[PDB]
C-alpha cells in the first residue's frame, strides 16, 4: 500500500461496525442461546438474568448475573421493579459488556420481572455509551393473563423512551398465522419468530449478500425508527418472491396500518438460486404500500439450508402514530 492508503487502512481499524445482541431474562436468554449455537454473523452475544439457573444453561459470548445483592441468583418472580433495580445494581457490568458497541440489539419477552424491568435499563446504558439502540421484544399471549400484559405494556412504554427503534412482536397474533397451533408449541413457535426477526435484522447488516448494505444507511433509518413491527413470509411457489413478500405484508404480526410508515428494512433470504431481480421485486412491492417518501433499506443473502424457498423479513418503522398503548395491548388507531 501507499502512505495515503496505509493511513486510511489504519483508520478502518479504529472505525468499524461492532454489533452486540443482549438477551434479558429467560425468553431473552433462550433467544441468545440459539443465536450463539446457530452462529449469528458479525455480532457479539450477551445474556443477562437475575436467575442464575437459567443463565448457567444459557450459551453466549458473555453472561451477566444482575441483582446478585437483590435477588441472590434467583428470578424476579414476575416483579418488573426487581428486574429494574437488579439492572441498576449491575449498570457498570452491563456497560462494560456493551462498551465499544456501535449498535446494540436488546431482546426479551415482556411480561416477566427481569426482561420487562431490565430491558429499559440496558437501553439507557446503550445510548449513553453512544450506540444505535434497537429493541426486539414480544408481548405475551392472552392466555398468560392480564397482569402479565399490563406489566409488559408498562415496560413497553418505558423501553420506548430509551430506544432508537423498538420492534414489537405480538405473540397473540401467532394464533392467526397457525390457527391449529397446539398450546404445547406456542412458545416454540414464538422462539422461531423471535430468532428470525433478530438474526434477520442483524445479518441484513453483517452478512455478505447479493447487494451491499451500507451501515450508514441503516443508521439513518433506525436512528429515529420509533415503534416498529414485523411481517414474515416465505414461499417456494412459482413466484417465490412475489408470494413471500405478499405473505409478509399481510402478516398478522404486522398489526397496523403501514401506509403511514416512514421507512422499512427488507431482508430477502433464499437458496443459491436467488437472484437480485427477485429481491428487487420484493422491494418494489413493499415500496408501493408505504409513503412515497419513506426510506427503504434492503438486502438479499443466501441461506445455505433453504433448498428452494425464499424468506422475506419486513420491518416497518415509524408506526407509533397509528398505534395506541393500552394496558391490554397494542391497538390500531
Ligand X SMILES: Nc1nc2c(ncn2[C@@H]2O[C@H](COP(=O)(O)OP(=O)(O)OP(=O)(O)O)[C@@H](O)[C@H]2O)c(=O)[nH]1
Any idea which residue has 451501515 for its cell?
215
Judging by DSSP bridges, how do beta strands 329-332 and 323-326 pair with one another? antiparallel
Residue nearest to ligand X (CB): 109
**113 annotated to a ligand binding site:** yes
According to CB under 6 A, which residues from 131 to 150 bind ligand X?
140, 144, 148
Longest dimension (CA), the chain: 65
CB of 188 to ligand X, least distance (A): 8
Half-sphere exposure of 70 (CA within 13 A, CB side): 23
The four Cα atoms 38, 44, 45, 50 give a dihedral, to 10 degrees, of 170
Tell me if 111 contacts ligand X by CB under 6 A.
Answer: yes
Q: Is 75 in the site for ligand X (CB under 6 A)?
A: yes
Tell me whether residue 115 or residue 226 sits nearer to ligand X (CB atom): 115
Judged by beta carbon, residue 108 or residue 279, the one nearer ligand X is 108
Is 26 near ligand X (CB under 6 A)? yes
State the nearest-atom distance from the C-beta of 170 to ligand X, in Å: 11
Q: In what order do the strands lie in the sheet with 132-139?
A: 62-65, 43-49, 19-24, 103-109, 132-139, 165-170, 226-235, 310-317, 263-270, 295-302
Region from 19-27, 200-208, 246-254, 280-288 binding ligand X, contact rule CB under 6 A = 19-27
Per the annotation, does 76 bind a ligand? Answer: yes
Site string for ligand X, 168-207 (x = CB under 6 A): ---x---------------x--xx--x-------------
280 is in an annotated binding site: no
Choose one: 74-82, 173-181, 262-270, 322-330; the region binding ligand X (CB under 6 A): 74-82
* Number of residues lying near ligand X (CB under 6 A): 26
Do the annotations mark residue 148 as ligand-binding?
A: yes
Candidates 76, 168, 205, 245: give the one binding ligand X (CB under 6 A).
76
- Of the pair 170, 209, the CB lying nearest ligand X is at 170
117 is in an annotated binding site: no
User: In the structure grid, which three cell numbers stand for residue 226, read together?
Assistant: 420509533
Residue 115 annotated as binding site: yes
Q: Which residues bind ligand X (CB under 6 A)?
A: 25-28, 30, 50-51, 75-78, 108-109, 111-115, 140, 144, 148, 171, 187, 190-191, 194
Which positions make up the binding site for GTP?
A: 26-27, 76-78, 113-115, 144, 148, 191
Amino acid at each position: 500500500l501507499s502512505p495515503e492508503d496505509k493511513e486510511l487502512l489504519e483508520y478502518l481499524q479504529q472505525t468499524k461496525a461492532k454489533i452486540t445482541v443482549v438477551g434479558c431474562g429467560g425468553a431473552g436468554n433462550n433467544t441468545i442461546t440459539r443465536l450463539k449455537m446457530e452462529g449469528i454473523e458479525g455480532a457479539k452475544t450477551v445474556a443477562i438474568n437475575t436467575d442464575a439457573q437459567q443463565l448457567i444453561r444459557t450459551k453466549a459470548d458473555k453472561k451477566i448475573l444482575i441483582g446478585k445483592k437483590l435477588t441472590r441468583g434467583l428470578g424476579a418472580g414476575g416483579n418488573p421493579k426487581i428486574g429494574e433495580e437488579a439492572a441498576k445494581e449491575s449498570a457498570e457490568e452491563i456497560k462494560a459488556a456493551i462498551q465499544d458497541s456501535d449498535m446494540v440489539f436488546i431482546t426479551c419477552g415482556l411480561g416477566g420481572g427481569t426482561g420487562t424491568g431490565s430491558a429499559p435499563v440496558v437501553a439507557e446504558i446503550s445510548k449513553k455509551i453512544g450506540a444505535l439502540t434497537v429493541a426486539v421484544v414480544t408481548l405475551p399471549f392472552v392466555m398468560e393473563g392480564k397482569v402479565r400484559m399490563k406489566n409488559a405494556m408498562e415496560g413497553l412504554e418505558r423501553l420506548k423512551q430509551h430506544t432508537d427503534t423498538l420492534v414489537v412482536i405480538p405473540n397473540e397474533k401467532l394464533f392467526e398465522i397457525v390457527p391449529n397451533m397446539p398450546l404445547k408449541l406456542a412458545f416454540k413457535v414464538a422462539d422461531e419468530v423471535l430468532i428470525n426477526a433478530v438474526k434477520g435484522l442483524v445479518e441484513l447488516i453483517t452478512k455478505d449478500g447479493l447487494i451491499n448494505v451500507d451501515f450508514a444507511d441503516v443508521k439513518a433509518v433506525m436512528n429515529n425508527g420509533g415503534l416498529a413491527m414485523i411481517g414474515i413470509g416465505e414461499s417456494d411457489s412459482e413466484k417465490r418472491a412475489k408470494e413471500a413478500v405478499s405473505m409478509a405484508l399481510n402478516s398478522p404480526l404486522l398489526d397496523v396500518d403501514i401506509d403511514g410508515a416512514t421507512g422499512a428494512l427488507i431482508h430477502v433470504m433464499g437458496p443459491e438460486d436467488l437472484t437480485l431481480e427477485e429481491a428487487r421485486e420484493v422491494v418494489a412491492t413493499v415500496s408501493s404500500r408505504l409513503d412515497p417518501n419513506a426510506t427503504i433499506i434492503w438486502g438479499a443473502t443466501i441461506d445455505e439450508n433453504l433448498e428452494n424457498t425464499v424468506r422475506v423479513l419486513l420491518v416497518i418503522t415509524g408506526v407509533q402514530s397509528r398505534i395506541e398503548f393500552t394496558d391490554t395491548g397494542l391497538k390500531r388507531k
